[PDB]
């Protein structure tokens, strides 16, 4: 395996006393989406100063991040004493997609030593440790974030100068202050300036062997080093993973200055990561002789989609967050920067929607004792069971059985389980596994061609199983049999007409073939009647040895309807609480398994009286009968309509929510549209909505003043005034 | 191997111990069952189950495999993919170059050519070196090779 | 076993990829979307076994 170097010199570690308390801080960082911040150079191409869409992994323009900053850990006088650090340690979170990060901005500048605050010490970057993994779970003392299997690890090494990475394999160590120690607290790793990083002499296996204190690494599968330069500027760095492994990215080597990130390395594991953590640092560094580090923060990708203004240099500058308002959809959709002053429409708002009521029911146990015993018929023998008024269970069912075939044409398999139907059909036989190969809905197979056929106008699903050894109440066929031959003789003694059988009906044949076929190849005959215009009847058979087990069959097909769906899967309906009769505006509903949302309404009551439902002459459900002798209307729920009027002279905005008036606004809307609508707020937060006999709008201001052309007229006499020029 | 072997199942059942959703493999990815599984499957229908803790979301993982009979001479298979890139198409068959001429200016025709395994036809010409530096391609917005 | 894949990547080489197929009788070679002809003689980004 990689050399990774020797084991540590002691199992013993360094306590951590945890400090976090100290480290709450609020100094936010939203992404600066037009200075092109976070954004992730496109893969392989480059660009002339031209302005294109894109789509790819990006930050939100929004999101402040998660911020994180390391620190000096105790010492007094002129010497190290005992950790104190953040509580970092517990932070796992669920990898998404990548992330990429901040480091260093706050450089140049002043803050606080953070766990020795009164200092007020001057502020510098400091580089981020990681891991990475498929899993996490309790140390043995329960705490957050032990690792298993192999882990991706990413630290810095002494100075920043030199970046390590490693897959390997961690192991919990049983001295003091050490995870397989009954006195660990939490585990951290340090850095000890006092003899660390001379200035001839980089101490390049520094932040590793502290690390190595706390864990013994096995089978180590990789390694890297990178080569890194002091710089105080700020830099980006991310992760990102597909099928071609892991990729790390940064904008040093290629665009320090402008930020964009570039695919600096590509790791070799394949494994998915499901979690990603921060790794705890501290400063072993003398009492005087403390140094505050700049903050570090952390951003998510999401799969978004983005307007990018490309430099003539090829450099990305600035970029727009397509769903982060509507004036952003805007400018997407003219691939533009500067859309001409207009009104223009945007997307409405979904209306708010609310949780279930349902009218099903009701019924009893769908009786499934048929199938409990005795033997199953032959291919050509089926047996039905038309199940109407009843409730059901079907794992219950599948209990009883091995499965050695499922599936089903036009459903899911667990939507056929939970689905509510005017009528469930089940045929079911005898069918050696032996002639599986021959049997599936579809199948040109002679017992598809002669014996049995499902109507694709339903969905179906198909089953084969065999029996238990504790299920003998059912029995075996002395032969498993089939028809396959099934056609009639012509009078004339010349020609043959051949008979495929029908969907969902039995073959003619039936009537001449025995229960069984006697012997394999066995061919039966019948006159035909002269009613029939005589000539003969005729067909064929073949068998299957019986097996240990019995094998069987079953044909599953459902049947829709409205108000004759009293079909369905066992029902619970406690703690609704409450059902029709309920209001609401908007809820989600399911009646008698027909799904829908709305609001109802209690009124008349108009014809045909139960007929359950009522619909338009375009099939949308009007208004329902129920249970309490009240007829509901529904009117679905109602949208919102929304535009945006755009003065691209003084660059300002304001908004019109049309015929919904301002007695349906609210400061904020779950309704919803766009992720927000601040951008309007850099003024409305401080105002009231206006009502206007169009609508309801958002910073108009009621100047009433007489205008002959404001060129952004609202309709009627309405218009909106730009404010003065510059 | 002693025996050919593979997986039959891998679903969590419910913490209620009734209800079970089955766990599909990612394409180009591990099934998340390999925890739990060993590296052969010592005997047919050989099955194994974890309990899943609450930060889990509960349940138990479960997990079957059959095997196959040994063969005197092994038998193997494999599955082959390949990826295009735009800057990094650095992967490629041995060149036959050897025993040709001099490479790539002609200026000239616009002649084929594959640069790094992209192919195309066209003319090049003296040009000064808009951005950016080690992209290599150069694209306009009709997704046309620029330079 | 086929929940314990090894692969393969290659970057930045060159190949000869029927050598590689004379060391083993192949009783089935099918592709998608490429001739498995064609596989041999394209260039790529990567290739994966
Ligand atoms: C960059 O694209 C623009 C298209 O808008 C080209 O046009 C010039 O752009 C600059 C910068 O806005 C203006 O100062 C010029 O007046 C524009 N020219 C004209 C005729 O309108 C520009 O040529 C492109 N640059 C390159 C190097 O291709
Ligand atoms: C790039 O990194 C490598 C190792 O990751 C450096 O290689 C060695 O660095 C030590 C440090 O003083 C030197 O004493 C050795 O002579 C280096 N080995 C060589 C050059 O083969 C390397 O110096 C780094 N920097 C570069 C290549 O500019
Ligand atoms: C504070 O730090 C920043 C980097 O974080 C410094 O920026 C660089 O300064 C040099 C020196 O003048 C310039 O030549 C570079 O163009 C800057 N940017 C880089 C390297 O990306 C800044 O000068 C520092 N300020 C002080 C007062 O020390
Ligand atoms: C400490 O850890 C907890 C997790 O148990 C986390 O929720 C919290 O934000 C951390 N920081 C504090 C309490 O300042
Ligand atoms: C990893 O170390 C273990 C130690 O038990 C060994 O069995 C295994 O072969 C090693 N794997 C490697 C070096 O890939
Ligand atoms: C008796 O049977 C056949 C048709 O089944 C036919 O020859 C004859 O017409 C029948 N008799 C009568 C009276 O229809
Ligand atoms: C409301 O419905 C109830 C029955 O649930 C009925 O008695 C009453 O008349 C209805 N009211 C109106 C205004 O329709
Ligand atoms: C706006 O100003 C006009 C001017 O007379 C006034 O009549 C009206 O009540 C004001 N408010 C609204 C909501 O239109
Ligand atoms: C991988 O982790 C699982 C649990 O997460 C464990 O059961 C399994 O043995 C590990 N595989 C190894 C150590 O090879
Ligand atoms: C152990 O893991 C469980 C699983 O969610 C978690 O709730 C708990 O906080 C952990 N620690 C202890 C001491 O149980
Ligand atoms: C044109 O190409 C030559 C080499 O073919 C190069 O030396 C020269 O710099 C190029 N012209 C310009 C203006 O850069």
Same mark, same amino acid.
């Given at each position: ?22 480290? &709450? ?65 517990? &932070? ?17 500048? =002043? ?29 043995? &003392? ?90 105080? /500027? ?36 394949? %494994? ?56 952003? *959809? ?107 190969? %021959? ?55 010349? =020609? ?19 229960? =069984? ?9 019948? *006159? ?27 044909? /599953? ?24 009769? *309920? ?35 375009? *099939? ?24 945006? /009027?755009? %003065? ?16 349906? /606004? ?61």
């Amino acid at each position: 395996y990689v050399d990774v170097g020797p084991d540590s010199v002691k199992s013993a570690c360094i306590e951590v006393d945890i400090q976090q308390t100290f480290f &709450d801080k609020t100094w936010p960082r939203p992404i600066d989406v037009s200075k092109a911040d976070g954004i992730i150079y496109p893969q392989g191409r480059t660009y002339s100063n031209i302005t294109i869409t894109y789509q790819g992994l990006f930050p939100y323009q929004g999101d402040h991040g998660d911020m994180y900053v390391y620190s000096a850990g105790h010492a007094t006088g002129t010497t190290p004493q005992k950790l104190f650090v953040a509580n970092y340690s517990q &932070d796992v979170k669920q990898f998404a997609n990548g992330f990429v990060v901040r480091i260093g901005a706050a450089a140049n500048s =002043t803050g606080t030593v953070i766990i020795s605050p009164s200092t007020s010490a001057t502020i510098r970057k400091i580089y981020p440790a990681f891991m990475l993994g498929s899993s996490v779970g309790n140390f043995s &003392d329960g705490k957050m974030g032990r690792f298993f299997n192999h882990t991706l690890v990413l630290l810095p090494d002494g100075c920043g100068t030199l970046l390590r990475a490693f897959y390997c394999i961690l192991e919990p160590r049983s001295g003091n202050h050490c995870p397989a120690g009954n006195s660990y607290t939490s585990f951290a790793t340090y850095h000890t300036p006092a003899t660390d990083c001379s200035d001839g002499n980089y101490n390049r296996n520094a932040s590793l062997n502290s690390f190595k204190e706390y864990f013994n690494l096995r089978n180590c599968t990789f390694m890297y080093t990178y080569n890194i330069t002091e710089d105080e /500027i700020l830099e980006w760095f991310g992760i990102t993973q597909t099928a071609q492994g892991v990729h790390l990215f940064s904008s040093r080597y290629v665009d320090l200055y402008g930020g964009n990130m570039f695919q600096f390395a590509t790791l070799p594991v394949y %494994d998915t990561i499901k979690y990603y953590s921060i790794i705890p640092h501290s400063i072993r560094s003398i009492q005087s002789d403390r140094k505050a580090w700049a903050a570090f923060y952390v951003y998510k990708l999401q799969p978004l989609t983005f307007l990018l203004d490309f430099s003539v240099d090829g450099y990305i500058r600035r970029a727009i967050d397509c769903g982060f308002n509507d004036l952003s *959809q805007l400018h997407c959709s003219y691939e533009s920067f500067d859309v001409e002053s207009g009104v223009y429409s945007v997307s409405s708002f979904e209306a708010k929607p609310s949780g279930s009521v349902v009218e099903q029911a009701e019924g009893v146990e769908c009786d499934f004792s048929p199938l409990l015993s005795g033997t199953p018929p032959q291919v050509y023998n089926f047996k039905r069971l038309v199940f109407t008024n009843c409730n059901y269970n079907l794992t219950k069912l599948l209990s009883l059985f091995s499965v050695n075939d499922f599936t089903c044409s036009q459903i899911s398999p667990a939507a056929i389980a939970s689905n509510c139907y005017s009528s469930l059909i089940l045929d079911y036989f005898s069918y050696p596994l032996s002639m599986k190969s %021959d049997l599936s809905v579809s199948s040109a197979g002679p017992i598809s061609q002669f014996n049995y056929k499902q109507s694709f106008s339903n969905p179906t699903c198909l089953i084969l199983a065999t029996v238990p050894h504790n299920l003998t109440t059912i029995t075996k066929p002395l032969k498993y049999s089939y028809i396959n031959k099934c056609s009639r003789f012509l009078s004339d003694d010349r =020609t043959e007409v051949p008979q495929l059988v029908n969907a969902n009906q039995y073959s003619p044949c039936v009537s001449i073939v025995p229960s =069984t076929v006697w012997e394999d190849g066995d061919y039966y005959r019948k *006159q035909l009647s002269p009613l029939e215009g005589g000539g003969w009847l005729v067909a064929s058979g073949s068998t299957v040895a019986m097996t240990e087990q019995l094998q069987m069959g079953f044909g /599953i097909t459902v049947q829709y309807g409205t108000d004759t769906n009293s079909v369905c899967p066992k029902l619970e309906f406690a703690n609704d609480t409450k059902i029709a009769s *309920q209001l609401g505006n908007c809820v989600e509903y399911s009646l008698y398994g027909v799904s829908g949302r709305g609001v109802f309404q209690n009124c008349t009551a108009v014809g045909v009286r139960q007929q359950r439902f009522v619909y338009d002459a375009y *099939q949308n459900l009007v208004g329902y009968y129920s249970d309490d002798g009240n007829y509901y209307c529904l009117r679905a729920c109602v949208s919102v309509p929304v535009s945006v /009027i755009y %003065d691209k002279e003084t660059k300002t905005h304001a908004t019109l929510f049309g015929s919904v008036a301002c007695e349906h /606004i609210s400061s904020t809307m779950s309704q919803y549209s766009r992720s927000t609508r601040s951008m309007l707020k850099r003024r409305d937060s401080t105002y009231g909505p206006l009502q206007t006999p169009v609508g309801c709008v958002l910073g108009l201001v009621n100047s009433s003043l007489f205008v002959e052309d404001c060129k952004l007229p609202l309709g009627q006499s309405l218009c909106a005034l730009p404010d003065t020029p510059s």
